[PDB]
Amino acid sequence: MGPVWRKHYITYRINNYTPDMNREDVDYAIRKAFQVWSNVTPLKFSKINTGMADILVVFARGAHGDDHAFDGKGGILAHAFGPGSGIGGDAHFDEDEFWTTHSGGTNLFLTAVHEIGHSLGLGHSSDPKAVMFPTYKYVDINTFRLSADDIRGIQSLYG
């Protein structure tokens, strides 16, 4: 349950870029992460560079202006606010992690799929195979799929 977006057109904006990855790789990871969720819902996501986006994507360090401070390398990798105005929906990634396109460090795509889950109103899964399982663990992103539980979860919220 919990809050949900009351529209099917949702915008996002990348507030800033980790220096860990090149810009196009960050854009790609985020775009593909939204696509994962749009593939199984009526939701559509558009990136904007100018304007008032629903979901702000932010990389930040330690105490960064909200009530969910980061903890340096390891521990919490990211956090996101559920649907709502203002800071609602926004997804924040811990810059003290080393973000990657791959298995080294912390994979941005996989983390973003999880965080966008939260941005859309999903909670955690008890399926060790679900992207909404509470702890990060790398899986081959080339064959990544939502689990049936993730799909049940998001379809119960939208459509």
Ligand SMILES: NC(=O)[C@H](CCC(=O)O)NC(=O)[C@H](CCC(=O)O)NC(=O)[C@H](Cc1cc(-c2ccccc2)no1)CP(=O)(O)c1ccc(Br)cc1
């Ligand atoms: N423990 C781990 O496996 C890695 C660290 C590994 C490392 O050292 O690199 N950390 C993690 O997996 C941590 C653990 C957080 C904790 O202490 O409870 N989880 C997190 O960082 C959560 C964020 C996450 C999970 C995943 C994931 C899960 C399954 C498959 C693929 C990716 N991707 O990002 C944090 P959150 O759920 O958004 C969150 C944040 C703040 C609040 Br308040 C509430 C919820």
Ligand SMILES: [Ca+2]
């Ligand atoms: Ca917002």
Ligand SMILES: [Ca+2]
């Ligand atoms: Ca951390």
Ligand SMILES: [Ca+2]
């Ligand atoms: Ca970093």
Ligand SMILES: [Zn+2]
């Ligand atoms: Zn934050």
Ligand SMILES: [Zn+2]
């Ligand atoms: Zn989570």
